[PDB]
Every structure is written in structure tokens, then in C-alpha cells.
């Protein structure tokens, strides 16, 4: 109702509807630490919040008071909890609360309390119809917002809304193939639907990734996905992969590719392959290429990897 | 350039004093701001510029003690501040009942942590009540919530639980088997650790996971050598000059600690490039007001000032104590805690 | 600008 910045705003201490309540002040004792100074309005709203809270008053006036408390500080988790208690006690329209929280989150998309509040509401309503579109809007202000992706995965999993996610992922990867959050989402969808054990799917994915790598060779995300879906089945079990990569080396080279190769060679040594002593040298040669010219910032790491390979396969 | 040590000491001093209303959104977590300042002064060996006794009393006034009837055990621990309006009580008289007063896992952690840094012996801490409250926060999947009334749950709070159990030297505060399960399940296909299963791996959650295991002394037992090598690879790939928290994200000063400390725990921080990391951190130093920011030419804050200093510590900066990479206190403080634990065992 | 961790 009465906005905090309305010309006719009145302190709670001066409102008739609140005459029967004694405000409760905050006290940090004799020597306060990390004390925050508050304005008259701020201290006034919270002095009454403390009062209502202390008496667990489930009133309509208390419900309206929380709106002000939240405008002053949306990071106060106790205020949000009490508001939820009131939403239930007064049996408020939850569809209306959804509009409220939708606006709040847009203004503060990195606040933990507001995302938690929306999740509780959706659980109460058992209605996810607005979620995917809402999140897509938030992801438009920041495509990597961890809170947004977290909420999106919860919704999809909880109400089994996998049907269009793989398509949404394809669309976003076209907007920015370097968004690590989207590659994670792709793995999320697939492993929770078809899985990767279906050779047809694995091939589709490995092919898809090699295509993205060809478009932007220097992309850790794409390389991590590729290695991710193959590392547990065994990198050395894919002979055509080793050659297809060695063929990219000329043009589409990058430290990520060289690293992948080193990892392939190591898988071979791990599985007692043919030419043990020769493979080990092909690896060491790459490790040094990484250290001296391809990924110099990790010079000492790559040399440490090399020394590890030698003392393990000789 | 160079490290402006005295400037940073004054910065932390100011934090412990008074803040502008524009910091009102930190009200419920003032205790962690205090931690950043105190632990920060400890790291610079300047705790002498504060009145340890006054601050210890303030901290104890934040403890949610069990009431006469002990019907609120599941809600004990520490508050982030006095925003609820409960009358000042430095853990002297018994707990005063209140429908919504209870602890917050991150505050119980930073609270105990502050007490140890200040030299207190935790004698006024109701250890059993805190552990009871901690147990109540754990979920079926092994992770934790921050408050008994309910909140989001993830790796951040698993780390808090671990630190609390470690400091009180008693792991009855959690079901370690379930927690370890949660940590394992958070490992991503790219080998980093995420906030939870299926989520994008992140520098912050990777630190929380690895540090929690090290505190339980089960790193080796939970991850295989092959697994640890993959985790190490993911972590060391985070260095661009300074460190970022996720692939393809811009570097941020605080990750010099989040990731740097993880690498230290995995014993390969020594293989990173020190100069570029140090240069980046210093480039975010505010030469006028002190402290550090997340990016260069950006306003400083207590969080980045503290973590930037701990990041420098990892490389043994001239003038900064060695930080205990898993407990998040100075090694000097971790040593005092070792003595405290020994003394109890009598 | 900042890092909200809670
Ligand atoms: C008080 C204390 C020392 C607590 C330790 C336990 C905790 C809470 C650790 C938090 C670690 C951490 C850095 C979590 C990530 C925080 N975010 C900023 C998450 C989502 O927002 P984004 O802007 O997408 O984050 P970013 O891009 O920085 O990863
Ligand atoms: Zn940061």
C-alpha cells in the first residue's frame, strides 16, 4: 500500500493501526562490532518488525510490514521465513505472490533468499508452467548466473520437463559456444534421458562437439565435454579419434588439443599397449611442447606430469 | 607493485568499527564480516590494535543457548547479529525463549573461528547444544541447510559443518558417511566439484568439498589416485594470471584463495606460476583506502581484502603469516587450536 | 562488483 518513498509515507511509530504495539529495539551491548548505522525510516520499520516477530502475530498488518522490511533488506532470511508463515496463516493468493517474487528476483538476481522463496512457492503450487520462460529471461541479463541454472535444473528434474531442453541448449550454444554453463546443461539433459551408453548417441555427441571445436578451437568447455563423455569408457579404445585429432593439430591446434593427446597416450600406457617405450616418448615430447611453448603458464605443472609418466612407465 | 601492509591494517580496523547504511544487507551476517577483519588482522600479525576482551563478549552475546527446559536444542549455535532484538547477554544467563531465534551454520562456524583467533578457550560455548543443532541441519542426501527453519542446501554448508566438527574436535555433529557421499556425487564430468550433483563444477564448491575431506582426514580414502589427478588438472587449469572460478569466466581475486588453497591441499600449488598470480592480486589493491577488490579499478570490500591477503599468504608474502589452507585461519591459530584440543583431553 | 556468498 503506502510506499517507502511516497510523499505521504508515515513512520510506523505515528500510525494509529500500530498504537497498541511497543517497538523492540536492537542492542549490540556496550561495545558494538561491525555496527551499521540506520536511518530513521529503516530503524522504524525494523523496530516494529522485531515486535511483531517476537509475538508471532499472524496478522494482515504484519504481512504488509514484511513488504517494507524486504524493500529495506531482501537478504534478511528471517523476514522471508515469517512472510511464508503468514502466507499460510492468512491463506494468501499464491499466484499473486509469484508475481511479487518474480519482480523482486529481476531486481536482485544474485540474492540467495529470493531464489529459495520462489522454489518453495513452486513446490506449494506444484505448478512449473512459468519457470522455464522466467529463467530464460533472467539468463538474458547474465547467461552464467549460477542461481538461475540451479533453479532451472531443479524444476526440470522435479516436474520431468526434459522435452525441450536439449533444443534450448543448442540455441544458447549458437549465441555463445564458450558458455561453460550451457555445456554442463547439455550433459545434464542427455545423461538424464537417453544416457551415453547408446553408441548412436555417443557418436552424435562426439561429432557435434568436434564440429564446435572446429568453429572455435580454443575453448576449454568443448574439450572438457568431449573428454568427459569418453574418459570413463577409455580414451584409448577409440583408434579413429587419435588420428582425427592428430590431423587437426596442423591448423586447429591449441593447448587443449595437445593435452587431450597426452591423456590418450597415457591411457594406452595404462592398458599395457604395444610400443610402451615409444608411446611414452610421444607423450613426453608433448608435455615439453606444452611447458616450453603451448601452455607456458603451467610450465612447471607439465614438467611435473612428464616426470610422473617416466617414473611410472620405464 | 608492493604490498601496502599498514594501509590494510587500518582498513580492517575501520571494518570493526562503524559501517554506512549502504551495508545494511550484511546485517544478518555481520559476524562473518567480523571474521574477515579479525582473521585478516591475525594474518598481518596486528591483533593488538583491537580490544580482544570487548569483541569476545560481543561474540558470546550472539550464541543461541538452550533454554531452561532445553526444548530448543535443535536450534542452538550462533546468530549473525542482534537484529532480532534479544537483550544483550554474553552467554551468562540461560537462553531466553523466542519463536524465531536460532543459529545459522555459517555464523556458528565464523563465530567459533573468531573466538579461537581472539584467544578464548571456548569454555562458554555449549558444545553439546551446538552439535545438536548441527545434526538437525543435515538432509537425507548428506548436505546441510543453514538454519532449522529451512533454506537452500549445498556444498557451502557442508564445509561449515566440517569446520565446526573439527574445531569442537567432535564429529558427532554429522553423519560423515552421508556427507562424503554428497561430496563424491558432486563431481562433474569435467572433474571439478559442483554445488550439488549435476550442477556446473565451480572453484568455490571444489574448495569446500576438498577442504571438508581434508578436515575429516579422508581425501585419499574417498578419491582414487586417478580421480585426484583429474581434480588437480581441473584446478590448475583455473589460472589465467590470477584465478577464475569456472572455465571461460573472468578472473577474480578471491579465487586466488578458493582454488589456490585447493591446489595447496592437493600438494601441487608449488607448480603454479607465482609471479602472475601475485601481480594480479596486487593490481586489485586499493592504494588509497586499503583492502582489495575482485577486479582492478573496482571498489574494495572485506571479503576480497581478506581472501586477497590469504592468496598472497599461499605464496609466503613478506609480512604475512602462513594460512592453514583447509581451516581458513592462520597456521599460528591452527596451532593454538591443537593445544586447546590437547588440553581438553585430560 | 561484489561476491555474495550467502
Ligand atoms: C564465511 C565463509 C568463509 C564461508 C565459507 C563457505 C562458503 C559460503 C563458501 C562460498 C564459496 C563461493 C565462492 C561460492 C560462489 C558464490 N557465488 C557468487 C554464486 C553465484 O553467483 P555468480 O555471480 O554466478 O558467481 P561467480 O561467477 O562468482 O561464480
Ligand atoms: Zn570474488
Supply database-style keywords.
heterotrimer; B: 346 residues; mainly alpha; Glycosyltransferase; two-stranded antiparallel sheet; two-stranded antiparallel ribbon; 14 helices; 4% strand; globular; C: 6 residues; little secondary structure; 0% helix; binds the ligand CC(C)=CCC/C(C)=C/CC/C(C)=C/CCN(C)CCOP(=O)(O)OP(=O)(O)O; binds zinc ion; zinc (chain B); Prenyltrans (chain B); repeat (chain B); EC 2.5.1.59 (chain B); protein geranylgeranyltransferase activity (chain B)
Overview of the molecule:
The complex is a heterotrimer of chains A (about 325), B (about 350) and C (about 5). Chain A has 15 helices and one strand. Chain A has about 325 residues and is an all-alpha fold. In chain B, helix 4 packs parallel to helix 6 (about 155-165), helix 8 packs parallel to helix 11 and helix 11 (about 255-265) runs parallel beside helix 13. Chain B has a single domain, classed as Glycosyltransferase, CATH 1.50.10. Chain B contains 14 helices and seven strands. The radius of gyration of chain B is 20 Å and the shape is globular. Chain B has helices at about 5-15, 30-45, 50-60, 105-115, 125-135, 155-165, 175-185, 205-215, 220, 225-235, 255-265, 275-285, 300-315, 330-345; strands at about 20, 65, 75-80, 145, 155, 325, 330. Helix content of chain C is about 0%, strand content about 0%. Chain C is rod-shaped, with a radius of gyration of 5 Å. Chains in contact: A-B, A-C, B-C. At the A-B interface, strand 1, helix 1, helix 3, helix 5 and helix 7 of A face helix 1, strand 1, helix 2 and helix 3 of B. The site of zinc ion has 5 residues of chain B, from loops. Zinc ion binds next to loops of chain B.
